[PDB]
């Protein structure tokens, strides 16, 4: 999946984290302007209390984006689907399935072989 594969609440969670770190930065500046959100976005995507909080938030953001990239890479790697048959020897062919329709044409040599190997 191009977008988030599962647990799509991560966007809301990171938005809430941005809001709380922004209000905390505002409080720290008051006890030392619509720019905290811009700083958070710049921290997320490259383009004493205040700096420490900003750098901790940047570390958390880079850890989160690294985890997201790793999850995307793992999901891309996981594809499987090796035709789900791999020759005659397969559980799907052993027990007939109504959903998966497969047969021969008519009473041909394949049909004779199937009848001869009656199992």
């Amino acid at each position: 999946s191009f977008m988030q594969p599962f647990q799509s609440t991560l966007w809301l969670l990171v938005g809430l984290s941005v809001h709380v770190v922004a209000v905390m930065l505002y409080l720290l500046d008051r006890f030392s302007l619509s720019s905290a959100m811009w700083f958070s976005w710049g921290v997320l995507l490259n383009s004493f209390s205040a700096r420490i909080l900003g750098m901790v938030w940047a570390g958390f953001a880079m850890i989160i984006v690294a985890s997201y990239t790793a999850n995307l890479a793992a999901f891309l790697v996981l594809d499987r689907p090796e035709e789900r048959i791999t020759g005659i020897n397969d559980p799907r062919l052993r027990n007939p399935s109504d959903k998966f329709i497969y047969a021969t044409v008519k009473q041909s040599s394949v049909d004779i072989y199937f009848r001869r190997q009656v199992e």
Binding site: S17, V21, M24, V56, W57, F60, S67
Partner: peptide
């Protein structure tokens, strides 16, 4: 767990 830890650390630092 990571977001809870970072929130706790931020609150403690504040």
């Amino acid at each position: 767990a990571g977001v809870f830890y970072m929130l706790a650390a931020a609150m403690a630092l504040s």
